[PDB]
Design a protein around this nucleic acid. Structure first.
Ligand SMILES: [Zn+2]
Ligand SMILES: [Zn+2]
Ligand SMILES: [Zn+2]
Ligand SMILES: [Zn+2]
Length: 118
DNA sequence: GCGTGGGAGGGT
DNA sequence: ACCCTCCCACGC
């Protein structure tokens, strides 16, 4: 088996291919958030090292993902993904309320719009 | 509308 | 430990 380091916590069946990966994962089961941001006057702490690294981009200003259309840079790949739909004009999320015919590019836009109807 | 955070869960 | 993708939230 390629992932032999198995979590033994109640309710969890996660498994990893390095012991250190299992060790970092298991700390969430006791509520640990050992990855604290060391920027001045920032009390943010995270259970995962990649969560802290993503967070600190708001301090450093590093944006490693660039739009091939307008050359704007973004700190997160998923935010670049939804951004590119502003150029394609794709609106995959349609409101189904009668005589509305509204369409939206992001899923949470439809959620907020659905709550407007009620 | 859409930038851009947090939380989460899958993979490696 | 890093990476990608999704929902959810808040702000203007
Ligand atoms: Zn576990
Ligand atoms: Zn911080
Ligand atoms: Zn763009
Ligand atoms: Zn509608």
């Amino acid at each position: 088996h390629m992932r032999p380091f198995m979590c033994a916590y109640p309710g969890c069946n996660k498994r990893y291919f390095k012991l250190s990966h299992l060790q970092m994962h298991s700390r969430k089961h006791t509520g640990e958030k050992p990855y604290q941001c060391d920027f001045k006057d920032c009390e943010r702490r995270f259970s995962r090292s990649d969560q802290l690294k993503r967070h600190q981009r708001r301090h450093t200003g590093v944006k490693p993902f660039q739009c091939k259309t307008c050359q704007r840079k973004f700190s997160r790949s998923d935010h670049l993904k939804t951004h590119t739909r502003t150029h394609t004009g794709e609106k995959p999320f349609s409101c189904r309320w009668p005589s509305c015919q509204k369409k939206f590019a992001r899923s949470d836009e439809l959620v907020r719009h659905h709550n407007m109807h009620q």
